[PDB]
Design a protein around this nucleic acid. Structure first.
Ligand code: 8GT
Ligand code: MN
Ligand code: MN
Ligand code: MN
Ligand code: MN
Ligand code: MN
Ligand code: MN
Ligand code: MN
Ligand code: MN
Ligand code: NA
Length: 326
DNA sequence: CGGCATACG
DNA sequence: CGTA
DNA sequence: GCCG
């Protein structure tokens, strides 16, 4: 079992969901308490289980696996022996976990904001609505549309949204393209949002594109919330039969020179990309982001025509998007 | 001991 | 800070 | 929490 998640295939459907979900509760809780290192370990351990070919039935099957130490092993041991881990259940049932999950699920609210509200005694969404002065415009939008934003986005929604984004993009710039990224490109059937990457084959023609796209969407009544810019984290008014629902949509524009790097970064998973960037820097001495791959000693950027090119320049076996579900 | 991904809005 |  |  390779130690980095970018060195192994992780399919969407795997064989250890019970174990991985328990470890991911501990990771989430570690985040709520401000320990990003513990969060990362528990996430990495859960991800290792997703990459295994068969169900773990015996604690012996963990020996030698990366990111399993005393704590993650004890969690698995108790789930195998008893079907429940006391620590996981305590966190699950705790007022702090439940409230931090509730608040951080809001668009515009992260851990530090949720923790402050928790410390102020706030506990419910209605508590927040009762104190609108304490909210940014982004948080106001997140709370206003929270019910819809909690409804899974389905493929039919994606296809309808792709059509209206393509229409606006084509009106704004002939020849520009729209690529579905995020979890749907990895094969997910559902999501919390839809992610789109926009470019143009002629370098530089995409300058100023995203404001023009947003204006065209806003004039068709499709925009409920949005913030020079190249990323827009939006809420769309998606038509439905006889009505509409709010959907989160992320739009990003990249020049075509950067498109493989942006496609790779925005296709995820989040853990896959953090692990790939860690691998790049720590094992290969190269700096990876959604713009490029930089060699800091020659002071040069690697020219890539595809995601495959990037994997190859990092000395990694290529993984298609459906195997990046780390 | 300390690192843990890396950027834009 | 928030978002990805 | 795990690891280089
Ligand atoms: N959520 C999230 N995405 C991130 C982070 N950093 C980062 O590069 N991304 C990239 O943004 C991509 C799209 O983000 P996303 O939150 O829409 O996640 P997703 O489509 O995989 O899952 P979803 O099904 O919940 O929408 C991810 O797939 C990930 O690679 C991060 O900290 N959080
Ligand atoms: Mn399998
Ligand atoms: Mn412990
Ligand atoms: Mn026991
Ligand atoms: Mn998404
Ligand atoms: Mn997104
Ligand atoms: Mn840029
Ligand atoms: Mn330490
Ligand atoms: Mn520690
Ligand atoms: Na949030």
């Amino acid at each position: 079992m390779p130690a980095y998640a970018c060195q192994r295939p992780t399919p969407l459907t795997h064989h250890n969901t019970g174990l991985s979900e328990a470890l991911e509760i501990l990771a989430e809780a570690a985040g709520f308490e401000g320990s990003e290192g513990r969060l990362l370990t528990f996430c990495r351990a859960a991800s290792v289980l997703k990459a295994l070919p068969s169900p773990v039935t015996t604690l012996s099957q963990l020996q030698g696996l990366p990111h399993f130490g005393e704590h993650s092993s004890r969690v698995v041991q108790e789930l195998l022996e008893h079907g429940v881990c006391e620590e996981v259940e305590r966190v699950r049932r705790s007022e702090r976990y439940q409230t931090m999950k509730l608040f951080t699920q809001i668009f515009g609210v992260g851990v530090k904001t949720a923790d402050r509200w928790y410390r102020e005694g706030l506990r419910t969404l209605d508590d927040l609505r009762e104190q609108p002065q304490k909210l940014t415009q982004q948080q106001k939008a997140g709370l206003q549309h929270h019910q819809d934003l909690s409804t899974p986005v389905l493929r039919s929604d994606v296809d309808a949204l792709q059509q209206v984004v393509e229409e606006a993009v084509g009106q704004a710039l002939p020849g520009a393209t729209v690529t579905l990224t995020g979890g749907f490109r990895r094969g997910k059937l559902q999501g919390h949002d839809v992610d789109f990457l926009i470019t143009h084959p002629k370098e530089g023609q995409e300058a100023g594109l995203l404001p023009r796209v947003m204006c065209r969407l806003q004039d068709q009544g499709l925009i409920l919330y949005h913030q020079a810019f190249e990323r827009s984290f939006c809420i769309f008014r998606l038509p439905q039969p006889g009505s509409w629902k709010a959907v989160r949509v992320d739009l990003v524009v990249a020049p075509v020179s950067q498109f493989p790097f942006a496609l790779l970064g925005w296709t995820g998973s989040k853990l896959f990309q953090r692990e790939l960037r860690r691998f790049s820097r720590k094992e290969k001495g190269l700096w990876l982001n959604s713009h490029g791959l930089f060699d800091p000693e020659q002071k040069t950027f690697f020219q890539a025509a595809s995601e495959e090119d990037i994997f190859r320049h990092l000395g990694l076996e290529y993984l298609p998007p459906e195997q990046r579900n780390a």
